[PDB]
Amino acid sequence: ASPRTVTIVALSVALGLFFVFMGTIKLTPRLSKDAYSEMKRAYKSYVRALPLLKKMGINSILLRKSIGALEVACGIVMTLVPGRPKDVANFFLLLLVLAVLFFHQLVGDPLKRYAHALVFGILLTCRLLIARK
Amino acid sequence: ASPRTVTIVALSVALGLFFVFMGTIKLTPRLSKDAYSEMKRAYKSYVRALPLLKKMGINSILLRKSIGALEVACGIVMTLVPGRPKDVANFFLLLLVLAVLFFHQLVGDPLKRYAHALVFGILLTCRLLIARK
Amino acid sequence: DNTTVFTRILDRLLDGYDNRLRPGLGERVTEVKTDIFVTSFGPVSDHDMEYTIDVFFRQSWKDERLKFKGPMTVLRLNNLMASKIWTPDTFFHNGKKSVAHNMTMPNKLLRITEDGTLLYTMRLTVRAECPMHLEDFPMDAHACPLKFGSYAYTRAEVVYEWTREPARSVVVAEDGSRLNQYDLLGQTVDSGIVQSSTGEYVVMTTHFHLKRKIGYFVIQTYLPCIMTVILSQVSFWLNRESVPARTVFGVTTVLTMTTLSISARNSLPKVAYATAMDWFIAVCYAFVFSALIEFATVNYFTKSVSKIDRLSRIAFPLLFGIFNLVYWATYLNR
Amino acid sequence: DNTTVFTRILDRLLDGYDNRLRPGLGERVTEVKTDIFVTSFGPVSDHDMEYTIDVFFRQSWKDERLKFKGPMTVLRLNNLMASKIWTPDTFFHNGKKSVAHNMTMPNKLLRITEDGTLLYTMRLTVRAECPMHLEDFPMDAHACPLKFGSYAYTRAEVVYEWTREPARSVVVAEDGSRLNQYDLLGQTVDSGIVQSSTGEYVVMTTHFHLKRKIGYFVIQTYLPCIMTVILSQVSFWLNRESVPARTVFGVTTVLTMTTLSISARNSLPKVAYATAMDWFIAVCYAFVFSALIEFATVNYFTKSVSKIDRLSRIAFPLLFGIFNLVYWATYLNR
Ligand SMILES: *[C@@H]1O[C@H](CO)[C@@H](O[C@@H]2O[C@H](CO)[C@@H](O)[C@H](O[C@@H]3O[C@H](CO[C@H]4O[C@H](CO)[C@@H](O)[C@H](O)[C@@H]4O)[C@@H](O)[C@H](O[C@H]4O[C@H](CO)[C@@H](O)[C@H](O)[C@@H]4O)[C@@H]3O)[C@H]2NC(C)=O)[C@H](O)[C@H]1NC(C)=O
Ligand SMILES: *[C@@H]1O[C@H](CO)[C@@H](O[C@@H]2O[C@H](CO)[C@@H](O)[C@H](O[C@@H]3O[C@H](CO[C@H]4O[C@H](CO)[C@@H](O)[C@H](O)[C@@H]4O)[C@@H](O)[C@H](O[C@H]4O[C@H](CO)[C@@H](O)[C@H](O)[C@@H]4O)[C@@H]3O)[C@H]2NC(C)=O)[C@H](O)[C@H]1NC(C)=O
Ligand SMILES: CCCCCCCCCCCCCCCCCC(=O)O[C@@H](COC(=O)CCCCCCCCCCCCCCC)COP(=O)(O)OCC[N+](C)(C)C
Ligand SMILES: CCCCCCCCCCCCCCCCCC(=O)O[C@@H](COC(=O)CCCCCCCCCCCCCCC)COP(=O)(O)OCC[N+](C)(C)C
Ligand SMILES: CCCCCCCCCCCCCCCCCC(=O)O[C@H](COC(=O)CCCCCCCCCCCCCCC)COP(=O)(O)OC[C@H](O)CO
Ligand SMILES: CCCCCCCCCCCCCCCCCC(=O)O[C@H](COC(=O)CCCCCCCCCCCCCCC)COP(=O)(O)OC[C@H](O)CO
Ligand SMILES: CCCCCCCCCCCCCCCC(=O)OC[C@H](COP(=O)([O-])O)OC(=O)CCCCCCCCCCCCCCC
Ligand SMILES: CCCCCCCCCCCCCCCC(=O)OC[C@H](COP(=O)([O-])O)OC(=O)CCCCCCCCCCCCCCC
Ligand SMILES: CC(C)CCC[C@@H](C)[C@H]1CC[C@H]2[C@@H]3CC=C4C[C@@H](O)CC[C@]4(C)[C@H]3CC[C@]12C
Ligand SMILES: CC(C)CCC[C@@H](C)[C@H]1CC[C@H]2[C@@H]3CC=C4C[C@@H](O)CC[C@]4(C)[C@H]3CC[C@]12C
Numbered sequence: 001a002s003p004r005t006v007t008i009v010a011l012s013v014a015l016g017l018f019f020v021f022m023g024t025i026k027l028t029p030r031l032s033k034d035a036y037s038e039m040k041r042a043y044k045s046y047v048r049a050l051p052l053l054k055k056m057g058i059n060s061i062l063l064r065k066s067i068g069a070l071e072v073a074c075g076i077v078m079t080l081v082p083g084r085p086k087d088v089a090n091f092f093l094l095l096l097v098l099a100v101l102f103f104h105q106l107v108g109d110p111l112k113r114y115a116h117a118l119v120f121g122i123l124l125t126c127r128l129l130i131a132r133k
Numbered sequence: 134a135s136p137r138t139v140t141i142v143a144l145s146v147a148l149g150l151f152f153v154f155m156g157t158i159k160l161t162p163r164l165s166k167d168a169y170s171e172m173k174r175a176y177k178s179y180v181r182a183l184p185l186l187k188k189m190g191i192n193s194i195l196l197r198k199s200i201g202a203l204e205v206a207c208g209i210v211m212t213l214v215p216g217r218p219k220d221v222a223n224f225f226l227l228l229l230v231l232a233v234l235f236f237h238q239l240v241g242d243p244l245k246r247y248a249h250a251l252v253f254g255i256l257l258t259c260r261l262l263i264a265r266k
Numbered sequence: 267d268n269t270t271v272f273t274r275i276l277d278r279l280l281d282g283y284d285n286r287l288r289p290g291l292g293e294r295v296t297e298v299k300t301d302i303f304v305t306s307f308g309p310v311s312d313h314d315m316e317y318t319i320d321v322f323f324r325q326s327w328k329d330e331r332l333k334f335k336g337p338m339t340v341l342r343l344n345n346l347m348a349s350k351i352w353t354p355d356t357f358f359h360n361g362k363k364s365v366a367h368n369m370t371m372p373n374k375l376l377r378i379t380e381d382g383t384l385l386y387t388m389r390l391t392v393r394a395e396c397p398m399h400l401e402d403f404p405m406d407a408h409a410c411p412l413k414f415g416s417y418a419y420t421r422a423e424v425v426y427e428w429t430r431e432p433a434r435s436v437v438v439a440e441d442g443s444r445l446n447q448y449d450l451l452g453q454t455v456d457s458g459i460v461q462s463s464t465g466e467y468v469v470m471t472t473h474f475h476l477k478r479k480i481g482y483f484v485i486q487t488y489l490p491c492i493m494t495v496i497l498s499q500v501s502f503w504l505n506r507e508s509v510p511a512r513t514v515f516g517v518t519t520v521l522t523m524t525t526l527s528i529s530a531r532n533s534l535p536k537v538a539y540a541t542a543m544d545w546f547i548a549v550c551y552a553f554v555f556s557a558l559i560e561f562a563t564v565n566y567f568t569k570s571v572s573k574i575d576r577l578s579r580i581a582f583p584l585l586f587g588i589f590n591l592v593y594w595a596t597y598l599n600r
Numbered sequence: 601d602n603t604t605v606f607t608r609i610l611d612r613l614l615d616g617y618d619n620r621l622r623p624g625l626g627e628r629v630t631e632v633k634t635d636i637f638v639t640s641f642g643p644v645s646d647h648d649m650e651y652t653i654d655v656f657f658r659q660s661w662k663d664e665r666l667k668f669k670g671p672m673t674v675l676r677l678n679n680l681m682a683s684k685i686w687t688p689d690t691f692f693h694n695g696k697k698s699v700a701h702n703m704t705m706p707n708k709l710l711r712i713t714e715d716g717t718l719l720y721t722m723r724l725t726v727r728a729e730c731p732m733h734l735e736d737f738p739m740d741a742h743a744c745p746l747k748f749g750s751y752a753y754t755r756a757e758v759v760y761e762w763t764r765e766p767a768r769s770v771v772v773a774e775d776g777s778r779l780n781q782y783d784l785l786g787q788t789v790d791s792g793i794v795q796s797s798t799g800e801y802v803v804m805t806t807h808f809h810l811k812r813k814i815g816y817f818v819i820q821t822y823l824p825c826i827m828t829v830i831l832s833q834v835s836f837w838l839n840r841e842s843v844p845a846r847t848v849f850g851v852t853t854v855l856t857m858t859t860l861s862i863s864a865r866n867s868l869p870k871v872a873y874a875t876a877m878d879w880f881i882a883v884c885y886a887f888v889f890s891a892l893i894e895f896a897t898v899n900y901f902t903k904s905v906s907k908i909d910r911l912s913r914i915a916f917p918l919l920f921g922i923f924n925l926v927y928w929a930t931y932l933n934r
Contacts, residue, residue, distance in 0.1 A: 049540045098555045105548035107540045108531050122517060128562045129513065182874040220900065231889040238882035240874050241865045251858065255851055261896045262847060486863040493856045503845040504838060511837040522827045529820040
């Protein structure tokens with residue numbers, strides 16, 4: 001098939017495959033218990049570094065669940081469901097990566113920690129640019 | 134008259150008035166002997182920091198004279214002579230400011246020293262953008 | 267002839283003198299008047315959370331056992347005499363009782379007045395611990411303490427008082443500042459009490475109030491970030507049909523912010539908590555990232571000037587301008 | 601009983617001993633074998649062009665006047681004995697004859713072997729001058745010397761030799777590195793002669809070869825500048841009818857380069873000569889400035905896609921790419 005037809009599918013599947021994988025880590029430690037242990041530490045700092053976020057009754061557990069819930073929900077959509085909802089999921093992920101990148105940069109973590117999110121941020125938007133002809 | 138008609142004349146006269154003033158300093162110390170004394174020091178460093186420039190027989194005295202000669206020649210043109218040559222003078226000045234800014238940045242001088250050149254660089258190009266309708 | 271007279275005086279003073287007993291051990295409390303002249307306020311070490319200071323430490327007290335009468339009302343003697351008599355064991359300690367690093371030169375001038383008053387000064391270089399709270403970095407201020415007192419004598423045996431008005435009893439040399447990235451706004455002088463396992467001791471304290479200078483970080487980090495945010499918003503004014511150009515714009519600008527963010531903390535120590543600078547960088551990163559996200563939305567609806575671009579031309583500059591006003595007002599009004 | 605035997609031995613050694621005369625002053629040349637163990641290579645101070653080093657300085661020589669026979673073949677004595685006998689007056693001097701700062705601890709172990717060989721080691725902290733040539737900064741390397749020798753004895757009276765193979769006679773501790781922004785590639789050991797006003801002296805020299813680490817400056821300066829240059833060239837791909845947008849692009853990018861240039865040398869000392877970094881920044885500034893100059897030319901001929909833009913799309917990236925290859929190849933192949 002055309003390179004555009006093949007390329008879009010690979011990015012759409014891969015990003016949903018990777019982002020759902022990340023969402024599982026924040027929720028179920030079965031895939032990698034160590035990853036969840038360190039991941040919860042990161043989200044403990046973020047809320048602790050965003051008092052007003054914690055002044056409205058929002059805790060790290062609620063924060064961790066919400067982000068993981070949307071990534072998996074949007075990740076599977078970008079893998080299986082075609083059409084306009086597939087692109088809508090892409091936009092929502094684009095609205096979470098900056099929040100993730102707004103948290104990592106709000107704690108001064110090195111590049112290696114948040115490199116994966118940034119790389120997929122470029123691919124995530126690049127997929128949207130090739131949403132339709 | 135129209136603001137554009139008034140504005141262009143002011144910039145064209147002012148830049149030629151200021152740049153010819155600078156060109157005089159590099160040549161005749163009568164206006165300010167101290168300025169020439171420090172100015173020659175700057176051009177001594179630039180050639181000394183550009184060996185190949187001095188490997189072709191070009192000295193600071195020749196360098197100092199040439200830049201001053203073109204600024205005054207182009208400065209007066211931008212003040213009195215109208216038409217296409219007036220704009221041609223503007224382009225040549227734009228081709229000297231970077232050379233001046235390529236020398237000041239090649240010696241690590243503070244902002245105060247080369248601030249005047251940068252400010253007129255913005256105005257010098259801005260005048261060209263309003264060369265004609 | 268002159269030496270013989272002074273030799274007899276020294277012998278008389280030391281005849282029957284017990285340096286093991288403090289003056290007034292059975293009659294009154296020995297009052298020691300102290301003042302400090304800071305010849306230079308050494309550099310601050312952020313990594314070790316300590317600072318160095320060179321001072322002329324002057325101490326004065328009355329010892330009636332050393333009364334004399336002679337041709338001179340004051341005896342300006344060699345510092346060797348100090349070791350031969352009893353002197354307070356004052357030391358500089360960081361915290362509660364841990365004596366801080368001290369480097370004392372051999373010279374320790376001793377002057378005895380006919381009334382029995384002693385002046386005892388020494389030249390010291392003291393390295394002291396100054397714990398720092400870097401939450402407001404680089405707009406933070408610290409109160410570096412300097413604590414000293416008796417090691418063995420409790421408040422019931424030795425008490426320290428300032429020679430004159432407490433504010434005037436600690437003097438900082440005009441040109442003694444050795445600070446590079448800090449400004450010494452002033453100091454506050456105070457005294458307190460500490461109860462340790464060995465008893466209760468009088469502690470004399472001075473707090474030096476330091477304010478970080480933001481000029482380095484304004485040039486290095488804040489200004490490049492602000493221009494980058496402004497630079498990113500120029501894209502809203504470009505035509506929507508320049509997809510290759512604007513995509514490179516978005517990606518390149520995000521890369522630049524990433525580079526700036528990495529180099530900002532390259533120098534700072536790895537502190538767990540987030541600083542004020544991190545919040546500013548993170549917000550700027552979101553603005554640059556969002557600028558590119560805005561274009562992706564615009565391209566999706568590209569079949570006229572996009573309405574999203576027209577609104578972004580106002581919302582983005584407005585919010586960023588408001589954020590700067592709150593941020594700078596919060597960390598500068600203090 | 602044991603003390604009496606050793607007391608007699610010490611008395612016998614010092615009986616008729618003249619510490620004012622070096623061994624062999626009338627028969628041969630006293631050969632001193634020396635080796636250095638660097639416990640830690642202290643920090644380098646660029647501003648003062650000096651460095652600190654903590655070492656165990658070991659010296660060995662034979663003094664036939666100290667021969668003995670007894671139950672033990674070696675006498676591991678207290679360092680107090682060293683002051684009672686003659687020892688070389690070795691000192692560490694920076695340059696020709698100026699003794700460098702030395703801080704020696706009281707402990708100076710002395711061991712005398714039955715054969716008459718002496719081992720004399722001391723713990724020293726030496727601050728030494730290391731003149732630096734920063735022309736290739738931050739890709740520069742320096743050879744910081746450490747020179748020591750006799751202060752009063754000429755080569756005709758005292759000569760220094762390395763205890764073993766010269767390379768193996770200077771040992772650096774594996775974890776003693778205290779360098780932050782430098783890498784210790786190695787050291788070279790050598791000896792020479794200096795002729796001063798007081799005579800001719802043997803000087804033992806060691807050069808420590810240091811290489812600056814470029815990682816900090818790559819992140820802080822080079823990368824932001826490279827992205828800015830690339831960012832500026834994106835303008836050639838924008839349509840010529842966006843004069844307000846592209847003018848803001850040119851001016852803003854020039855401002856960013858100006859900000860980056862200012863903060864690059866904020867930390868470096870004010871050296872008269874230009875460094876390698878300055879040349880890179882200056883060239884990048886010209887490229888950014890020229891990008892805006894190119895648009896001014898294009899607008900002047902705007903009544904089709906400009907031919908100047910089409911050519912600039914190739915010339916500018918090509919020249920900048922070539923410049924990087926020559927620049928990095930020049931300062932890294934060394
Ligand atoms: C600061 O200035 C002081 C004074 O010039 C320097 O010397 C130290 O002075 C202290 C008194 O002001 C001393 O306490 C300290 O050494 C002490 O030694 C005691 C044992 O006495 C033996 O050693 C001393 C010193 O060599 C010697 O004179 C004596 O004849 C004996 O051989 C220790 O008991 C004492 O420890 C104290 O603290 C510990 C903490 O855990 C307690 O457990 C003990 O009960 C006791 O209270 C202490 O070690 C002097 N030290 C030295 C090296 O001279 C300091 O060195 C200066 N500071 C620095 C950083 O250099
Ligand atoms: C390095 O290590 C040394 C040794 O531990 C420290 O002490 C210095 O040792 C030197 C010998 O190695 C001494 O020369 C120097 O002091 C000298 O004093 C000579 C005069 O003698 C009087 O003073 C000494 C020291 O107090 C005393 O012991 C003696 O009884 C006398 O009172 C000076 O002539 C000599 O000057 C030399 O250099 C000048 C240079 O212009 C020449 O003009 C002279 O002709 C002469 O060659 C020198 O001053 C010891 N100094 C001290 C302070 O102890 C050093 O201090 C260590 N270095 C540092 C930086 O601390
Ligand atoms: C037309 C557009 C062109 C865009 C070109 C982009 C090129 C890449 C852009 C560079 C931005 C990132 C630069 C990072 C440099 C430092 C990397 C590094 O050191 O990584 C590891 C270790 O890395 C190394 O040891 C060297 C790695 C060399 C290989 C790098 C490969 C980079 C590939 C970039 C690909 C970009 C593709 C873009 C496509 C649009 C350590 O992480 P730190 O950066 O030190 O983390 C911060 C830690 N601290 C704050 C404490 C200082
Ligand atoms: C839509 C586009 C918007 C563009 C907005 C641009 C705004 C200005 C851009 C800022 C770039 C320059 C920032 C310079 C900051 C430092 C200035 C400074 O300290 O100046 C004096 C002293 O200045 C002061 O004491 C404070 C000055 C405050 C007032 C500044 C006014 C700035 C006006 C900018 C106007 C821009 C107009 C742009 C129009 C297109 C000392 O010089 P240094 O910068 O230290 O020189 C380097 C020395 N060393 C390397 C050794 C560290
Ligand atoms: C659409 C465009 C809008 C532009 C709006 C501009 C608003 C005004 C600001 C313009 C530029 C201001 C540049 C200020 C440079 C200050 C340099 C500096 O170091 O200042 C220090 C004072 O501190 C500051 O200036 C702190 C930062 C001030 C604010 C900087 C940002 C500008 C204001 C916010 C702009 C928001 C733009 C929003 C755009 C949408 C002085 O340090 P010191 O004297 O304590 O010691 C320094 C040391 O000795 C070495 O020299
Ligand atoms: C149109 C796009 C063209 C792109 C061309 C790309 C060409 C390849 C380069 C891609 C990016 C390379 C990024 C390299 C990052 C290196 C980070 C670093 O610190 O490297 C040091 C090694 O030194 C370097 O890497 C020096 C710089 C290398 C070159 C950097 C620029 C890229 C090459 C030139 C690009 C030209 C682009 C032209 C565009 C028209 C390692 O330091 P250290 O191990 O000695 O100690 C560091 C310390 O421990 C702290 O961590
Ligand atoms: C932390 C959170 C960050 C979030 C960043 C989000 C950036 C991207 C925002 C996109 C909003 C619009 C989504 C699409 C909606 C839609 O239906 O758009 C199509 C039409 C316009 O169609 P056409 O006229 O272009 O053909 O659209 C319309 O008719 C209506 C368009 C409304 C646009 C509203 C734009 C609001 C921008 C706010 C920016 C805040 C930045 C804060 C940064 C911390
Ligand atoms: C240190 C020195 C730095 C110098 C930087 C100079 C930047 C600006 C260069 C402008 C060159 C062109 C001047 C104008 C000549 C001219 O007549 O142009 C009009 C026509 C095109 O007309 P139209 O088709 O646009 O209507 O033009 C033509 O028909 C011919 C156009 C030829 C364009 C040549 C462009 C070459 C660019 C080289 C860039 C090197 C950068 C090096 C940086 C260190
Ligand atoms: C993701 C969105 C909701 C974040 C919004 C953040 C808002 C509420 C602002 C208001 C006050 C701000 C805080 C004010 C002061 C500090 C201390 C500083 O050392 C780290 C950042 C931190 C902790 C800020 C984090 C962000 C903050 C909480
Ligand atoms: C204005 C134009 C003609 C400048 C062209 C510069 C060319 C010839 C290049 C070739 C080799 C370069 C030099 C190579 C090495 C150094 C040492 C460095 O510490 C400062 C820059 C300096 C001194 C360079 C200056 C620029 C240079 C002379």
